Amino acid sequence: VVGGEDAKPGQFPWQVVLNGKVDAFCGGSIVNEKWIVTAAHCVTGVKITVVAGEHNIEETEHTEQKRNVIRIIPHHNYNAAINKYNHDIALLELDEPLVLNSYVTPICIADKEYTNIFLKFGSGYVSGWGRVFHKGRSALVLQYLRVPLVDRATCLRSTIYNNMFCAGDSCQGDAGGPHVTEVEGTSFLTGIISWGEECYGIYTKVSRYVNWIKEKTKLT
Amino acid sequence: VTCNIKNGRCEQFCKNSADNKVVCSCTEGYRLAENQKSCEPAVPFPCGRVSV
Ligand SMILES: [Ca+2]
The missing domain is CATH 2.40.10.10 (Trypsin-like serine proteases)
Structure with a gap:
C-alpha cells in the first residue's frame, strides 16, 4: 500500500497474508475459521501458506496462525487465458481451522x-x-x-x-x-x-x- | 418511519413489516439489541469487530 x-x-483481524516461494505475495480475508477469500490470479496450485493474526511479518508477536491450503476454488467463470483480472475471486480451504480471537476474526x-x-x-x-x-x-x-x-x-x-x-x-x-x-x-x-x-x-x-x-x- | 429513510434507524439491516413498521436485523454472530435498532455480539468473537 x-x-x-x-x-x-x-x-x-480478518486480514490474512499468502506465502509461497516468496513471502507476502498476496492478501486475503477470513470468511470463517476454515475458509479464506482472495483473488484467483494469486492462486498456480503450488504450496500456499495462509497466515492470520499477522501484524509485522518480521516479528513473532504470538498472535499469528499459519495454515496450509488443501482446496482452492477459483470462481467457475474465472479464466486466466482471456482476461485474467475478471471474475477475479477464489476461495481457499485451510488444513486446520483457525482459532478465532481478538487478532483472528472473520x-x-x-x-x-x-x-x-x-x-x-x-x-x-x-x-x-x-x-x-x-x-x-x-x-x-x-x-x-x-x-x-x-x-x-x-x-x-x-x-x-x-x-x-x-x-x-x-x-x-x-x-x-x-x-x-x-x-x-x-x-x-x-x-x-x-x-x-x-x-x-x-x-x-x-x-x-x-x-x-x-x-x-x-x-x- | 420506514427503511428508505436512515435505513429505518437500523444499525445493519432493515425490512418493512406488514403494518408499516421497521424490522431491524443483524448478520451472523450478532443479535438485535434491547433498543430494537442496534446489533450486539451473540458469540465471543463476531465478524468485523476490533476487540483491542
Ligand atoms: Ca509476525
Missing part, C-alpha cells in the same frame, strides 16, 4: 443487496503487506488506507465493471486483500483488491459473488 499508514495490532458478508448499499457509502478500507513505493520493498507492518468510491464515467477513462469497481493506491502484494466498509463499528466485505499498477485502483464487486461465497464456505 502507498500513502497509507501503519495498522494497529488487531485493527484488521469479515462480515451481507447479502447481495446490502453489500452493494455498503459499497455506495463511498468510503472503504483497503489493506495488505504490498509495496510501500512504486518499485519499493514489501511492507514490514500491515498498512491500511481509506479510498473513496469513483463513479462509472470517471473510472472508464482507462472495465467489465458489472462485477468490478474503482476507488482511490493498492500495490503489488495487496492483491486478493479486502476492500471493507465499516457500518456503525462493524466491518463488511465490499470488494477484493484486483490491482493498482500505478501505485485509480480496480476492485472486484463482492456483492455479485456473495451467494457463491456463502454456499462454498458452508461449515458442516
